[PDB]
């Protein structure tokens, strides 16, 4: 039927420029306005602007006036978003939508744009062992810091898959060009450090797969 196909993730570095595409089928883009909407990680939708393919007319939110240039090619039923002078502020999901005043409202899958100077780095997986007033409880929590890698993703497991719950793997956060994530695990104090506990992370992009036993500090 109708579909707006947007590029998959696009990786770019600070200062660079990117032109996202939005290809439409099932309708002619001249019959509506083509919009571009930004959404930073766990934040709200922000209307960037739109284009009226037919007339070429474009409108923008003054916030994006100097950053965005939206264009359209009716010949190919496609709309573009040209973002310039990329900053870490530009990392987000960029949606293209086709709509104007009525029920005709369709959205693309979103293009997640990541802005980083970084190059494909492997993660440093360190084991998180307890500050005791919590081992001293019915259950104890342990973890693993999966620090300094790029780009996403990574997968994490505990005791190879024998520890599936009492687990919380936190979403990754890109700071100073690199990501970092954590995973927590709760087992009874009768089950550690008597029996063992190990986390296993994997970052396909570095071809890295490590394992790490949590051992008590001198405590």
């Amino acid at each position: 039927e109708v579909q707006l196909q947007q590029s998959g993730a696009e990786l770019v570095k600070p200062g660079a420029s990117v032109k996202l595409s939005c290809t439409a089928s099932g309708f002619n883009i001249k019959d509506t306005y083509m919009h571009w909407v930004k959404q930073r990680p766990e934040k709200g939708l922000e209307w960037i602007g739109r284009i009226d393919p037919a007339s070429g007319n474009t409108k923008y939110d003054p916030k994006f006036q100097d950053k965005a240039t939206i264009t359209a090619d009716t010949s190919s039923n496609t709309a573009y978003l040209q973002l310039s002078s990329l900053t870490s502020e530009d990392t987000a999901v960029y949606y293209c939508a086709g709509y104007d005043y009525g029920n005709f409202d369709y959205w693309g899958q979103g293009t997640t744009l990541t802005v980083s100077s970084a190059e494909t780095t492997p993660p440093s997986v360190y084991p998180l062992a307890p500050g005791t007033a919590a081992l001293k409880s019915s259950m104890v929590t342990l973890g693993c810091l999966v620090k300094g890698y790029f780009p996403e993703p990574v997968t994490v497991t505990w005791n190879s898959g024998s520890l599936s719950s009492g687990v919380h793997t936190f979403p990754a956060v890109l700071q100073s060009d690199l990501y970092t994530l954590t995973s927590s695990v709760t087992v009874p104090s009768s089950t550690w450090p008597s029996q063992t506990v190990t986390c296993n992370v994997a970052h396909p992009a570095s071809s890295t797969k490590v394992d790490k036993k949590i051992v008590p500090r001198n405590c």
Binding site: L45, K59, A97, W107, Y126, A129, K147
Partner: protein, 214 residues
Amino acid sequence: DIQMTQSPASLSASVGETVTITCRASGNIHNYLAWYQQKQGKSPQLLVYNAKTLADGVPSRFSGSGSGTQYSLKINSLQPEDFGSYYCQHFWSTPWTFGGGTKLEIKRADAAPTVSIFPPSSEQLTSGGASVVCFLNNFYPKDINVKWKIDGSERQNGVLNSWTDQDSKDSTYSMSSTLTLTKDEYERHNSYTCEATHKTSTSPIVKSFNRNEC
């Protein structure tokens, strides 16, 4: 040139309850207002356009109203699939601004977080870095703030916080707070603590370890 002020930023409800989200335009929009629904990990979808006309495939438990500057989205019999985010958007004048959004979540009983602090790993010390981690798990509601103190003095730079979505099984929330220091600094200090501030207490839930007191 008009902005929309959406409320509440967060709504906790149960299955079956009735609920309303409101958006007030900072100017008159003549009912040129639309409501969007955005599920976890999906694209926004039109719910209501022109303040009151339901969009394609939108059920009847949904309804929009108002005029001029105050609009409301109501969901009569909350169904499990309604949980997610809602956003209003005016299409009166350029720019077609979105309201800040509302996160509709599953309400349950309050639950204080289980806080756990972890000193740097020796494999990290060996490398020159020293990260202190605090896990504050299974709390409710989702509002929470953590602050790190190194020997009593608060520290703001070098903190990486991360939060999970509402748990599918128990509906709680969880947070991770990493304090990244260099081994240099980590070794010329002793007390390291992280204080959780949550609605279940007037005092912060605090955890801490002393570097040489082991």
